[PDB]
């Protein structure tokens, strides 16, 4: 998260760390959202490479024992049947991970409130992006959980040639683009918390940024519009 601040331990308690076993130890590759005690919603782009994944709930400082962490393995990976790695611009960048076991919900570990199917936010809607991603373009991962005020840019504007053009599908949410604040390498799959009816719901799944860099003016962080997939998310979880 570029241009972000340090979050409070209990602030965003659905936020997970998707780590892969890099030989000796575990490395943070992506973000995620605990939707069930045994189900995790991340980006398909994260689970492309056949690695050994573990999900850590209750994380704050990757490199330091927070005393609140729960370490659970991923028994099952369900990537959206239309996900085509070579065409992230096509969308469908959403995956569901069935955890080897259920996590214990506390003030550090809660479930992510999903939006109503088909829900489109208005332009400039108050959203936050959280994650342990690069604080700078080509920089390094944040030790502690960073948060940034990333208001929304509707489809009408985000599909402008001055913005993203046709790279962005209606199935996507755009937030930020101020050139100061954004999402970066590592934030992927992690959650775009939007304030609706006084309640924070996970409207977005961090997909991509501009090849030119993370915090690029008129190149807002593109999220996978969770509200489009609600049906699928339910079907998968119920057949599993």
Determination technique for this PDB entry?
A: X-ray
Residue 93 falls in the annotated catalytic set: yes
Resolution, given in Å to one decimal, reads 2.5
Q: How far apart are CA 13 and CA 8, in angstroms?
A: 10
DSSP state of 172: E
Strands (E), the chain: 5-6, 15-22, 25-34, 39-42, 53-57, 70-79, 95-99, 127-131, 146-149, 152-153, 172-175, 191-196, 199-208, 221-224
Active-site residue, selected from the candidate residues 159, 182, 188, 227: 188
20-38 CB burial, b ≥16 within 10 A, e <16: beeeeebebbbbbbbbeeb
Active-site residue, selected from the candidate residues 14, 17, 28, 45: 45
Q: How far apart are CA 6 and CA 8, in angstroms?
A: 7
Is 235 labeled as ligand-binding? no
| The two structure tokens encoding residue 235 | 């079907």
Query: C-alpha distances in angstroms, 129 versus 37, 90, 117, 191, 220?
Result: 22, 22, 21, 6, 12
Computed on alpha carbons and rounded to an integer, the radius of gyration of the chain in Å comes to 16
Helix H or strand E segment including 230: helix 230-238
DSSP state of 89: G
The class of domain 1-12+112-227 in CATH terms is mainly beta
Residue 45 falls in the annotated catalytic set: yes
List the one residue out of 167, 205, 169 whose CA is nearest residue 189: 205
Is 69 labeled as ligand-binding? yes
Q: Bridge partners of 194?
A: 127, 201
Same topology for domains 1-12+112-227 and 13-111+228-240, yes or no?
Answer: yes
CA 86 to chain centre: 20
List the one residue out of 212, 14, 163 whose CA is nearest residue 103: 14
Q: How far apart are CA 78 and CA 98, in angstroms?
A: 8
Cα 96–Cα 100–Cα 102 angle in degrees, nearest 5: 90
Q: How far apart are CA 124 and CA 175, in angstroms?
A: 8
187-216 CB burial, b ≥16 within 10 A, e <16: bbbbbbbbebeeebbbbbbbbbbbeeebbb
Q: How far apart are CA 196 and CA 204, in angstroms?
A: 13
143-176 CB burial, b ≥16 within 10 A, e <16: ebbbbbebbbbebebbbeeebbeebbbebbbbbb
Share in percent of the chain as helix, strand, coil (round to 5): 10, 35, 55
Active-site residue, selected from the candidate residues 80, 93, 203, 210: 93
Is CATH 3.30.70.890 the right assignment for the domain spanning 13-111+228-240? no
Q: In the chain, what are the domain boundaries? A: 1-12+112-227, 13-111+228-240
Handedness of CA 92, 17, 204, 107 (dihedral sign): positive
| The two structure tokens encoding residue 171 | 């199935």
Note whether 18 and 72 are within 8 A (CB): no
């Amino acid at each position: 998260v570029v241009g972000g601040t340090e979050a409070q331990r209990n602030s965003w308690p659905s936020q997970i760390s998707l780590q892969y076993r890099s030989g000796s130890s575990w490395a943070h590759t992506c973000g995620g959202t605990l939707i069930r005690q045994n189900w995790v919603m991340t980006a398909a782009h994260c689970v492309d490479r056949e690695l050994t994944f573990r999900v850590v709930v209750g994380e704050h400082n990757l490199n330091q024992n927070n005393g609140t962490e729960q370490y659970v393995g991923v028994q099952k990976i369900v990537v959206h049947p239309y996900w085509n790695t070579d065409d992230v611009a096509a969308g469908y960048d959403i995956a569901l991970l069935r955890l080897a076991q259920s996590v214990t919900l506390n003030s550090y570990v809660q479930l992510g409130v999903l939006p109503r199917a088909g829900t489109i936010l208005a332009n400039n809607s108050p959203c936050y992006i959280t994650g342990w991603g690069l604080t700078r373009t080509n920089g390094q991962l944040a030790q502690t959980l960073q948060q940034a005020y990333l208001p929304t840019v509707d489809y009408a504007i985000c599909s402008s040639s001055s913005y993203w053009g046709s790279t962005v599908k209606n199935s996507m949410v755009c937030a930020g683009g101020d050139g100061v604040r954004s999402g970066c390498q590592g934030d992927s799959g992690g959650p775009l918390h939007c304030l609706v009816n006084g309640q924070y719901a996970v409207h977005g799944v961090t997909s991509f940024v501009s090849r030119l860099g993370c915090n690029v003016t008129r190149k807002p962080t593109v999220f996978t519009r969770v509200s489009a997939y609600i049906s699928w998310i339910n079907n998968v979880i119920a057949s599993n």
